Amino acid sequence: IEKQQEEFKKQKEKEQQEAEKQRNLEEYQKKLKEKLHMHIVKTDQERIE
Amino acid sequence: MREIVHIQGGQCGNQIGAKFWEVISDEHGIDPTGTYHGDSDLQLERINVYYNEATGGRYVPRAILMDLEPGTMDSVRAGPFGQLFRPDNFVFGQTGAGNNWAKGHYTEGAELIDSVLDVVRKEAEGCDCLQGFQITHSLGGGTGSGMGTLLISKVREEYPDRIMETFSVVPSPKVSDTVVEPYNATLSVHQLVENADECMVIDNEALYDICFRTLKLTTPTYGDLNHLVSAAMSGVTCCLRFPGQLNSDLRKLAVNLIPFPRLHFFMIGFAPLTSRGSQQYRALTVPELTQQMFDAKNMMCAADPRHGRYLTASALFRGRMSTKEVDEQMLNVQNKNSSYFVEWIPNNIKSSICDIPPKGLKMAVTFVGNSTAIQEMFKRVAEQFTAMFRRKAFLHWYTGEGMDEMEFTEAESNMNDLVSEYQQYQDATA
């Protein structure tokens, strides 16, 4: 019986960590893309000049 | 209208043409006596693309055959469909080049080329609206790789706005038949990049690999390699001779497959290809064609296309089929392989549909893709060239006919620069 409770406790903890990790990665990628676009705009101005 | 003339040089080019013209004649129903015996009306509507008209109702190809020795053209005349060629277009010398690039480009090829240029000028000035020229030659031979490439520059100097095609066989290090192959390969690649609007590399090693693995026939011969090359050659201009949903001439492919003027070296492949015993098992569907079309072993070059990323790709479907399926399959082949497609140019696959399939087949596809994986061939060619040149081996043969080592150094440097700047875009990111 001890094994049964322990087994479910160890499995439950797993799954939660995987979902959280995916969410963090996606947010980071979107912010980085915005910064890159602004940097590109300044570079564009110099070549045009 | 918008027709092209055929020019071939060397033994390899003559043997390629001897099957290309047979394939074209069989496609248009022209008997080896020049008399039409076809079945369909469409077989005659656009016959002016490749064939001229003479009195008596017979047709004659507008091909020009040149070599520095008379044997190969004296042999091709006795073969099937050998009588179609006009005897006036045969031009040859009495000496030969002996696989020496200098002899076929400086001493002997320079004096003879005036006569062949005369007939070339006669053919081009006359035709209704010129589309361009297509050239078949081998880079492993002296007379071919010299005279053909000098003729390329001479033609380009007089017709700067027309389009130019070259189907070039480069010497692979696996199946080597000549010891001086690296020298005249490296010298020819130097001149070929400056003038050819399109170039299509073909390797004998890849043809043997295809024949042994896909067709699974026991004893390949030059006739099978020539037949595969001829089918691939015919597939490119099919929609220019037949109606279709989306016609696309050679210039349209030139616009869509060459991003920068110096990146015009493509590798091609033909589908479907099946063995005799398995031709009944398979069912011809668009997914079956597209899965074999992008197969790595199906390429006509030993270059491995999953060692690099495609800059762009093209497909010329044949037969009557739905366009929605073609577009969705092209999208699917590009979503499942995003790692092998460059990311700063979206939607880099061109498609075209022609309603007339090849004789005997219900569907066919010709694939022309510009990929960064082609660098490996120039790398190995330059490696062999620099391994042989550092000791000045066989250099006296070339230097005894007015050539010097400076032109070798410049050729090596330009070829290495091409190799470097071709891969420069592989690591480029947005």
Partner: protein, 430 residues
């Protein structure tokens, strides 16, 4: 005494013109030979005794499609010398068809336009069809629109352009010429209708239940939309609408005239008659986001004005009772400064069926032309695609060498940025 002239340029334009001209001939009882075995006057002209001649002109630089037209069953219908054809194709290059080869052909087209216009006495306006993602289509359409805008002035011109799909594409360079052509027709065309292929593919798949559609199925739906739009000029109706009564009802500001269309019902004869096809359900289906004729989501933006045409036995009170229901729904919201946004037209003639086609015969139909703020997404995604390749100046050499200046690409980008800013500025509430 009311007339309209339709212009067809490019392969897609000619292939949709064929589609609309079977339908008109069938709807007015005219046989393919042009002989009948007073409503025809809008599209046709009487020759004095016998045949009728369409008020249409076909343009293309590539001769294959015109030659196909001149040999089909409709060879006797069109006047022999209004099917203007070139010799050399533009090959997807916009600069070619605007600066190099289109200029020598445009004069003949303008002469034909004058010769057709002098015959009409009550000219309502012009119609033009052109697939945007091609060289000759976009370039010649731009040049013709620019010439007509100054030759005639205030006459109304309508453009049924086919923009590329969000992800599905046939070429690789179509964003460049799409952006340039949008630049050209932004300040030169009174109405532009969105027609990308992916949405119509989804419509066919979901409703018509065709899993392998071809271009003809798409063109038949487009032809039906055109017929529904122009029915009010040649048939008696309780609530008529003219072409000139559009910029007063759908175009709030001179810059904003891009709108997207929808049609209902679309159903096959195998399951059409099992349901009653009431006016309420068809007008609900017409407003469904999945039935938009362009792949854009109307839920992502406000509506500005909706002009929607009925035909058949519909009664105005049933139309009002259905407009009220749509105003009730919470998922469809109009812009603040527009209290009423519906213009309703009712016609008595039911839609005609083409034999061997997809659509069945029904007594009621609805066609909507709706101007919405959500259209900015296609501009944004086309702009993003353009920027990726314009960052590295890819494929630019194919345009600079055809007479176009380097700076011409930037100002189209600036005009698109201005249009996107304008669409955002209009959609904010006061």
């Amino acid at each position: 005494m009311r007339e309209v002239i339709s212009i067809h340029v490019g392969q897609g334009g000619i292939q949709v013109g064929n589609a609309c001209w079977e339908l008109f001939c069938l709807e007015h009882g005219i046989q393919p030979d042009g002989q009948m075995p007073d409503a025809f006057n809008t599209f046709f002209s009487e020759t004095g005794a016998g045949k009728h001649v369409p008020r249409a002109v076909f343009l293309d630089l590539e001769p294959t499609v015109i030659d196909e037209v001149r040999t089909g069953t409709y060879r006797q219908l069109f006047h022999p010398e209004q099917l203007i054809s070139g010799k050399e194709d533009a090959a997807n290059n916009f600069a070619r068809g605007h600066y190099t080869i289109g200029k020598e052909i445009v004069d003949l087209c303008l002469d034909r336009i004058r010769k057709l216009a002098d015959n009409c006495t009550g000219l309502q306006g012009f119609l033009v069809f052109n697939s945007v993602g091609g060289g000759t289509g976009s370039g010649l359409g731009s040049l013709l629109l620019e010439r007509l805008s100054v030759d005639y002035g205030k006459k109304s011109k309508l453009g049924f352009t086919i923009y590329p799909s969000p992800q599905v594409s046939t070429a690789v360079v179509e964003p460049y010429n799409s952006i340039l052509s949008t630049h050209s027709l932004l300040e030169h065309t009174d109405v532009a209708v969105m027609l990308d292929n992916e949405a119509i593919y989804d419509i066919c798949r979901r409703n018509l239940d065709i899993e392998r559609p071809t271009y003809t199925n798409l063109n038949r739906l487009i032809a039906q939309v055109i017929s529904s739009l122009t029915a009010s000029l040649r048939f008696d109706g309780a609530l008529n609408v003219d072409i000139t009564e559009f910029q007063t009802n759908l175009v709030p500001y001179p810059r904003i005239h891009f709108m997207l269309s929808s049609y209902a019902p679309i159903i096959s004869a195998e399951k059409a008659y099992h349901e009653q096809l009431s006016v309420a359900e068809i007008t609900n289906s017409a407003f469904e986001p999945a039935n938009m004729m362009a792949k854009c989501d109307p839920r992502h933006g406000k509506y500005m004005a909706c002009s929607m045409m009925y035909r058949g036995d519909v009664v105005p009170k049933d139309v009002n009772a259905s407009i009220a229901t749509i105003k009730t729904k919470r998922t469809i919201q109009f812009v603040d400064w527009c209290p009423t946004g519906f213009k309703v037209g009712i016609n008595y003639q039911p839609p005609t069926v083409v034999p061997g086609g997809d659509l069945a015969k029904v007594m009621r139909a609805v066609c909507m032309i709706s101007n919405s703020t959500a259209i900015a997404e296609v501009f944004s995604r086309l702009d993003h695609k353009f920027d990726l390749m314009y960052a590295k100046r890819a494929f630019v050499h194919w345009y600079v060498g055809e007479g176009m200046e380097e700076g011409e690409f930037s100002e189209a980008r600036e005009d698109l940025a201005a249009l996107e800013k304008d669409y955002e500025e209009v959609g904010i509430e006061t």
